[PDB]
Amino acid sequence: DRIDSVSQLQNVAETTKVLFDVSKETVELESEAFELKQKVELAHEAKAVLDS
Amino acid sequence: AKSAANKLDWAKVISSLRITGSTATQLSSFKKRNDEARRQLLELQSQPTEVDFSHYRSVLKNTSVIDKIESYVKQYKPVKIDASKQLQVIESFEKHAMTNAKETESLVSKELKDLQSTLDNIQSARPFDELTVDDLTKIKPEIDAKVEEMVKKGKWDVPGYKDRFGNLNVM
Amino acid sequence: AVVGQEHYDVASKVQETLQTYKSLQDIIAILGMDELSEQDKLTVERARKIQRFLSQPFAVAEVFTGIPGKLVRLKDTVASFKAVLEGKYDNIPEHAFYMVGGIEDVVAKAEKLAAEAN
Amino acid sequence: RQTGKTAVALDTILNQKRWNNGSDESKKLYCVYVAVGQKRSTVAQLVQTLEQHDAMKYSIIVAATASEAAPLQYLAPFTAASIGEWFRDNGKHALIVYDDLSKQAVAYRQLSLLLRRPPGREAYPGDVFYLHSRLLERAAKLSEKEGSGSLTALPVIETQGGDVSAYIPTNVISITDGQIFLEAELFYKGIRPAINVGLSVSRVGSAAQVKALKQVAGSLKLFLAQYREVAAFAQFGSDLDASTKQTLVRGERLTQLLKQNQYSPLATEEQVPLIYAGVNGHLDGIELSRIGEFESSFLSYLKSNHNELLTEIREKGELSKELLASLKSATESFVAT
Numbered sequence A: 001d002r003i004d005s006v007s008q009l010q011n012v013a014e015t016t017k018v019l020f021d022v023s024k025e026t027v028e029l030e031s032e033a034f035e036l037k038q039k040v041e042l043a044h045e046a047k048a049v050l051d052s
Numbered sequence B: 001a002k003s004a005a006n007k008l009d010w011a012k013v014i015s016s017l018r019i020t021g022s023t024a025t026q027l028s029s030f031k032k033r034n035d036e037a038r039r040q041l042l043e044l045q046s047q048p049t050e051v052d053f054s055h056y057r058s059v060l061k062n063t064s065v066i067d068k069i070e071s072y073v074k075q076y077k078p079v080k081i082d083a084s085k086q087l088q089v090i091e092s093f094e095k096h097a098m099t100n101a102k103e104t105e106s107l108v109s110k111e112l113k114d115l116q117s118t119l120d121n122i123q124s125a126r127p128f129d130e131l132t133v134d135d136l137t138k139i140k141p142e143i144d145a146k147v148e149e150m151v152k153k154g155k156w157d158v159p160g161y162k163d164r165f166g167n168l169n170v171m
Numbered sequence C: 001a002v003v004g005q006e007h008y009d010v011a012s013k014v015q016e017t018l019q020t021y022k023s024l025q026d027i028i029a030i031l032g033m034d035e036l037s038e039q040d041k042l043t044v045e046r047a048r049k050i051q052r053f054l055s056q057p058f059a060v061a062e063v064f065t066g067i068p069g070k071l072v073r074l075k076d077t078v079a080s081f082k083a084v085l086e087g088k089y090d091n092i093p094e095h096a097f098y099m100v101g102g103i104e105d106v107v108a109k110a111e112k113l114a115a116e117a118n
Numbered sequence D: 001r002q003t004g005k006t007a008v009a010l011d012t013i014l015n016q017k018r019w020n021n022g023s024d025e026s027k028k029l030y031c032v033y034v035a036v037g038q039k040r041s042t043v044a045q046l047v048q049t050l051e052q053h054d055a056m057k058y059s060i061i062v063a064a065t066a067s068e069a070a071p072l073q074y075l076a077p078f079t080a081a082s083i084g085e086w087f088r089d090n091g092k093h094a095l096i097v098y099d100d101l102s103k104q105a106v107a108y109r110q111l112s113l114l115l116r117r118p119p120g121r122e123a124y125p126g127d128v129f130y131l132h133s134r135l136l137e138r139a140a141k142l143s144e145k146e147g148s149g150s151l152t153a154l155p156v157i158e159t160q161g162g163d164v165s166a167y168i169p170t171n172v173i174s175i176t177d178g179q180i181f182l183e184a185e186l187f188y189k190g191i192r193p194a195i196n197v198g199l200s201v202s203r204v205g206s207a208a209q210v211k212a213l214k215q216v217a218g219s220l221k222l223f224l225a226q227y228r229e230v231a232a233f234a235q236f237g238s239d240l241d242a243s244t245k246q247t248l249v250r251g252e253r254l255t256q257l258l259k260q261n262q263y264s265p266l267a268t269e270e271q272v273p274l275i276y277a278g279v280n281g282h283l284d285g286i287e288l289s290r291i292g293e294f295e296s297s298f299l300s301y302l303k304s305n306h307n308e309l310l311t312e313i314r315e316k317g318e319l320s321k322e323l324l325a326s327l328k329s330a331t332e333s334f335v336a337t
């Protein structure tokens, strides 16, 4: 039973490699989204003000 | 392009029934989910971020202010540059993760090799009815140490000895 | 959008309890509370409590109620009914919700009935 | 009264923005609202609501205010029917919601009762049936020889105390190709669309339905029969055995799922996974109240690295065996979490 349990560490590291990489990668790639948020807000304000 | 990343992430999640009890891995999962949801919501709701001066200005006749706001927008087109600040601390997290992964897999590989050796030995080297007591004593001096210690202590009892071994006692 | 999704949920759950109560009135009269399961019995008791709590004294009706009128703020009443819906005041008798204002008045009336009256 | 009639009319109205913002005119569905007997404040609410959700551009508001003369209320649905017939005869598809139309009925009753015309039943004139039928029959699906246009009618009836068995209600039901019943009973019982599955019947079940939603797995077709069974053996009926318990749980979870927030038109590419989840993985839901958030989480799950399935069921229309297997796998993966 211990053998069967340890059989599952055989390839966990290979997948969790890309998992841990892309986790932080995607979490920090929202910087461009944050920079786009202010531009989108400015555009929304401009459209609203000219609608006014 | 994103399909492979979260596909392998949830593959690891499907493997993660055994590392249950984690604190922030699932929390980081909902964090990624919330951030990407805000991504797609802002990208879908984002109308073309420019005033249609050809038509959406021509409808207004006495504006006197469309030129001002358009000039302001044009001057503020470079709103801000991307923040690629993280170049070493994230690398530190990755080198820690690499160290943990390599030491882990070394441990796993050596443990499986040891346990196939164990089963292979146990298959045809199991003297159930022909094991020598002298061989047992020589293999493990710990049982010898225990025996002399309890002999010199005077407590001849061996706690937990009638639990599995019968007595056939005529008494 | 106008309410705030909290007072709206409280009102929705109040309507839930009252509609279930009215639907079960027929078998309550015919059979009784025993026939209902534990969830239905709890729902009926809670709905009775809310319906009693709906009574509010009015300053222009003191000669009729005999109790000074109460002016309950919106936040006060929504918080009180949210607390009632969670079952925090299930042990309190339903009569304590009769001619009261906020949940503090409910607690006061329950204490008076439990100590001075009983 | 105020059981969600104009509300479901509004969700039908707003859902068309998905296709009206495109280019395929064969899928564009122009909208015509008939505000006969409604008050001007309600019509302003309506027009602003359509303005917010980018819907006023393709919708048409024909308002017959109660303060306006009764002949105007009588005629406004007919004029809106002509407006929709313009789209219908030019190869376009028009949805006209004859909201109220009981106010038009009473306005025409006023017209007859001051025009010296003797009335019929409950002082209603003779041709309220003929009026309703003649007005509604203008809504039809034209053949390809006539441009393949269509004109869809969504009339309303404001019943008095749930009295479906009344002259005007049963009269209009005999005209329309099916009815959508809403009562306060289900409205306060929790059903937010207030869809009374019993007396709500559509005259074209298999047709006029998305192929991905009609039968695909079979259960989606006898969905209505299953709901009728659940009503017939609801909590009042004795819980016979484990099969009966499973049927009751299935019905309760299904009616839990059907609740939908106002001004939230949920597309068929997102409807189909939810209806399928109501047949497999529905029974093990963690409390009935949590299905509300479970639906949102399942939508989010289908959005992430499953948009291929969503666009496949949106574009193709039919569901293949491999598509059904993929949907089952996704449902199992989600219910596992």
Ligand SMILES: Nc1ncnc2c1ncn2[C@@H]1O[C@H](COP(=O)(O)OP(=O)(O)O)[C@@H](O)[C@H]1O
Pocket: D001, D002, D003, D004, D005, D006, D007, D008, D192, D193, D194, D260, D261, D262, D263
């Ligand atoms: N999803 C929903 N479906 C139906 N009604 C809703 C929903 N959400 C909120 N409501 C409430 O139900 C009422 C629907 O009544 P309405 O359709 O206006 O009938 P009428 O126009 O005949 O008064 C609205 O006042 C609204 O506040």
Ligand SMILES: [Mg+2]
Pocket: D004, D005, D006, D007, D099, D100
């Ligand atoms: Mg209405």
